[PDB]
Amino acid sequence: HHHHHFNLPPGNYKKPKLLYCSNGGHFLRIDPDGTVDGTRDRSDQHIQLQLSAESVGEVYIKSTETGQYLAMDTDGLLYGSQTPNEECLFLERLEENHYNTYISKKHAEKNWFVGLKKNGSCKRGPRTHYGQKAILFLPLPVSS
């Protein structure tokens, strides 16, 4: 189990979702240029994400607008990848019996999470850790 707990969130991957971070209220965003950050603008066309399970509890998070995959690099920075690779897999887990957290599969032994600061900037892998609000997400339905 990668030396991590296995409490999984409910919900499925049938439809795209917005990944809302409760820390600052930002939605995760992957720009066509590959930069990742968060925005409070719900009309943004780069916050609609499609998650898919490659194994139970292991997901890819892809921009539905650009087809890019969320990934975390060797130095802990999130970026949008044009193709799927080992840096694009995340262990999706329930947290505080309510939220979803995403731990980098490649860097799971160091507990590097996907996280957004209150100012909307992504947190670097080593700066994240259990207990922070930056790592707590709620997958919300995409607007209609």
Letter for the amino acid at 32? Answer: P
Q: CA separation (Å) from 21 to 29, 35, 131?
A: 11, 17, 14
* C-alpha–C-alpha distance, residues 127 and 108, integer Å: 14
Binding site per annotation, positions? 23
Enter the resolution in angstroms: 1.8
The domains located in the chain, with CATH, are 1-144 (2.80.10.50)
CA 96 centroid distance within chain: 17
List the one residue out of 108, 97, 88, 85 whose CA is nearest residue 136.
97
Binding site per annotation, positions for heparin? 23
* DSSP code for 110: G
